[PDB]
């Protein structure tokens, strides 16, 4: 709710956050266009030429399009790896507890939540 | 999401860190220090506390005889920890310092984008539009070198701050190995007092060690002697110190007052009563004679 | 009260529980050098290309920091091989631990 | 102070530092290691040396039957420290380098 | 117009200056009370003068 | 401004070194003065008394 004389909002770092539309006076949020890094997850080229791609910190309703597997992790969107419900020791760390590895499925890149070890009641 | 700067999520989630801390606590409580050196061997918890009392030089009968009092003192101390952290607004100030330095560096980096850097304007579109290609090119190069230097400064400060964080994490790992996975004999490592146990607790970007230590409490003055002369022989305590309450002589353990009759069982003989400076005259009981004669 | 034959010996004790707080990791950050300096100004990008390989080595430095943070956490907390569970009956001789 | 560069005095004066080190020495000489873990408990100094000898794996009678020799050796070594510091160039080299 | 270069320089030097006092505090202010040595300086023949 | 920035960076590196030294001195005060150490060569050459 801008005061009647105020035209554009601005943030802590003095970046324009909102505007008032001049024709019709409503307040419009401005959000930066989605960006991020792109990581390539591979087993060695000595094992396979298969690849998975991670778009870091990006919801992938905005990714323009490895494999058709598309998974949403807290690190970003993962393409070319399927999320299984097992847990193993971390092979390739993706982030937020998610790892990836090359496994029989015949072989493909899978994503999973890493196991911390085997339970043991003394 | 601002100006090409990104924050990556840590690999281990806070739930995973808490699972680690729970495994460490369960191992300590159910098996002592054994799970850190091999397989976890179970032991009753009071027996573990008796081992810890042995490790600081106090006999385990002291633990077994004061078990309920020791348990009560421990429970009160843990409750007081909870209360103390609920209060004293800046007790977690080291974690906050790390967070704040991180945030200040980033906000400074963003605010350096607006500085003219000696150029006509801080906006690339404006410099592009309002000047011819060559002059605008020179102005934009001034902006570029300014921003590049600012970014280089930020990265160098991050390297220095990460070196300090690595020193702190190395110390924390040493304390997890030596205070939580063992009982430490190093002084003031693992808190002030004689270390008994430590418990880890996970904190945002950090760890909290609760150190359980033994503190001697109510002192008494006694007279002491280095050796005792009996039959022209000098006797020294095998483990303990000779004390006197004014009339009678006992041998006690050095960290807890528990007087006992001076016997050939708790002393050893060496030499005669001539060389030791301060040797006193007393009798050393021999259990064998009365139980042999009777 | 130092004298040449007097000793002090404690007759009781107390159990202290004190607290130590240690930082372990910091925030992992990354920077797009181009998008920071230039911001979709193709003239800025073209000019920036002629300053050498500053961008790649800032990138490498920040990546090293980010990997080190996860290593810090792993070498503080993953000190148990197995995930131990406490028994369902929580009696430990009168010590509470709750 | 020359050109906008100034030097701030330390919070603890050298007399205060001397007071702390003197208290540490008084505690060690009069009580042993007890003042570092709780209240300070007086102990005669030869008995404290006997405890230290048990600490390194020697018995007490080795201290008490050689007490005069051990005290003389200690006194001579301390005097040698005094001399060795009087005359050696760059003995305090680390502080100078700082 | 150069920005906050000279607020962060001052902040960095202030951090160093506070750290120096912390260094001295942690090395020397370990003892809680000021212990005094007795007037009679006999310690079994050991000479601490 | 660049020369002053370099001075502050060198001061930060040197202060980190001094802090490591002062942490070691605090550890030695705790473990060699306020106790008797079993760590080899941590206090001196020989068996620490
Ligand atoms: C501008 O004119 C349009 C005509 O439809 C009107 O709806 C709108 O409210 C006007 N805005 C202002 C600020 O006068
Ligand atoms: C994008 O993904 C995030 C999950 O990280 C979700 O919260 C958000 O609603 C998604 N956006 C849309 C438009 O679905
Ligand atoms: C021992 O005696 C001295 C006086 O010589 C006194 O100051 C001190 O408080 C006494 N210690 C205890 C534990 O009562
Ligand atoms: C010393 O202890 C003995 C116990 O055997 C007791 O009989 C005696 O009365 C005590 N002497 C003094 C002076 O308290
Ligand atoms: C101890 O007893 C022996 C013989 O009974 C005697 O020669 C010596 O003087 C006594 N010592 C003291 C201090 O009374
Ligand atoms: C302790 O005894 C010694 C004799 O070896 C003597 O020189 C010293 O003065 C005595 N100390 C006191 C306080 O009586
Ligand atoms: C030791 O102190 C406790 C208080 O923590 C007290 O209740 C108990 O009576 C004391 N023990 C003796 C033997 O005085
Ligand atoms: C442990 O302490 C809590 C208070 O935090 C208390 O409610 C609980 O009863 C205690 N456990 C037992 C077994 O008494
Ligand atoms: C201690 O040594 C000094 C020489 O350093 C000497 O002058 C002094 O007399 C000695 N003290 C005693 C009590 O002998």
Swiss-Prot record, chain B:
Chain segments annotated as coiled-coil in the UniProt record: 96-140
Effect listed in the UniProt record for changing residue 35 to L: In strain: Eta/B.1.525
Region (Heptad repeat 1): 67-117
Annotated consequence of substituting residue 174 to I: In strain: Gamma/P.1
Effect of residue 239 to K: In strain: Theta/P.3
Effect of mutating residue 248 to Y: In strain: Theta/P.3
Source domain of life: Viruses
Sites carrying sugar chains: 221, 245, 281
Disulphide bonds in the chain: 179-190, 229-273
Function: Subunit of the fusion protein that is processed upon entry into the host cell. Mediates fusion of the virion and cellular membranes by functioning as a class I viral fusion protein. Contains a viral fusion peptide that is unmasked after S2 cleavage. This cleavage can occur at the cell membrane by host TMPRSS2 or during endocytosis by host CSTL. In either case, this triggers an extensive and irreversible conformational change that leads to fusion of the viral envelope with the cellular cytoplasmic membrane, releasing viral genomic RNA into the host cell cytoplasm.
Listed name of the protein: Spike protein S2'
Native organism: Severe acute respiratory syndrome coronavirus 2
């Amino acid at each position: 709710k801008f005061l009647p004389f105020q035209q554009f909002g601005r943030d802590i770092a003095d970046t324009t956050d909102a505007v008032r539309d001049p024709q019709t006076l409503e307040i419009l949020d401005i959000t930066p266009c989605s960006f991020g890094g792109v990581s390539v997850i591979t087993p060695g080229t000595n094992t396979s030429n298969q690849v998975a791609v991670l778009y870091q910190g990006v919801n992938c309703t905005e990714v323009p399009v490895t494999g058709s597997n598309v998974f949403q992790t807290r690190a970003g969107c993962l393409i070319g790896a399927e999320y299984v419900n097992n847990s193993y020791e971390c092979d390739i760390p993706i982030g937020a507890g998610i790892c990836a590895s090359y496994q029989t499925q015949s072989q493909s890149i899978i994503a999973y939540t890493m196991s911390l070890g085997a339970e043991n009641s003394v | 999401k601002f100006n090409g700067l990104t924050v990556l999520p840590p690999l281990l989630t806070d739930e995973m860190i808490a699972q680690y801390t729970s495994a460490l606590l369960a191992g300590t409580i159910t098996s002592g220090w054994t799970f850190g050196a091999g397989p976890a061997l179970q032991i009753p918890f009071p027996m573990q506390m008796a081992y810890r009392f042995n490790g600081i030089g106090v006999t385990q009968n002291v633990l077994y005889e004061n078990q309920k009092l020791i348990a009560n003192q421990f429970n009160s101390a843990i409750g007081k920890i909870q209360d103390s952290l609920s209060s004293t607004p800046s007790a977690l100030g080291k974690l906050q310092d790390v967070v704040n330095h991180n945030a200040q560096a980033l906000n400074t980096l963003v605010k350096q984008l607006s500085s003219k850097f000696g150029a006509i304007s801080s906006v690339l579109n404006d410099i592009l539009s309002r000047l011819d290609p060559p002059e605008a090119e020179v102005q934009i190069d001034r902006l570029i070198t300014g921003r590049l230097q600012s970014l280089q400064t930020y990265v160098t400060q991050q390297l220095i701050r990460a070196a300090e964080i690595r020193a702190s994490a190395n110390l924390a790992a040493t304390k997890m190995s030596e205070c939580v996975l063992g009982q430490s004999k190093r002084v003031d490592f693992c808190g002030k007092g004689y270390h008994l146990m430590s418990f880890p607790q996970s904190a945002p970007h950090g760890v909290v060690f609760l150190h359980v230590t033994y503190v001697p409490a109510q002192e008494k003055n006694f007279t002491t002697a280095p050796a005792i002369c009996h039959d022209g022989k000098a006797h020294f305590p095998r483990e303990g110190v000779f004390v006197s309450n004014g009339t009678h002589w006992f041998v006690t353990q050095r960290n807890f007052y528990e007087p006992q009759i001076i016997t050939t069982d708790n002393t050893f003989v060496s030499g005669n009563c001539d060389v030791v400076i301060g040797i006193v005259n007393n009798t050393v009981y021999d259990p064998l004679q009365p139980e042999l004669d009777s | 009260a130092y004298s040449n034959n007097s000793i002090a010996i404690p007759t009781n004790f107390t159990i202290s529980v004190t607290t130590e707080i240690l930082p372990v990791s910091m925030t992992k950050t990354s920077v797009d050098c181009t998008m920071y300096i230039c911001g979709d100004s193709t003239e800025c990008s073209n000019l920036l290309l002629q300053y050498g390989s500053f961008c790649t080595q800032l990138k490498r430095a920040l990546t090293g920091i980010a990997v080190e943070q996860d290593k810090n956490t792993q070498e503080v907390f993953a000190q148990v091989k197995q995930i131990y569970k406490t028994p369902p009956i929580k009696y430990f001789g009168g010590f509470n631990f709750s």
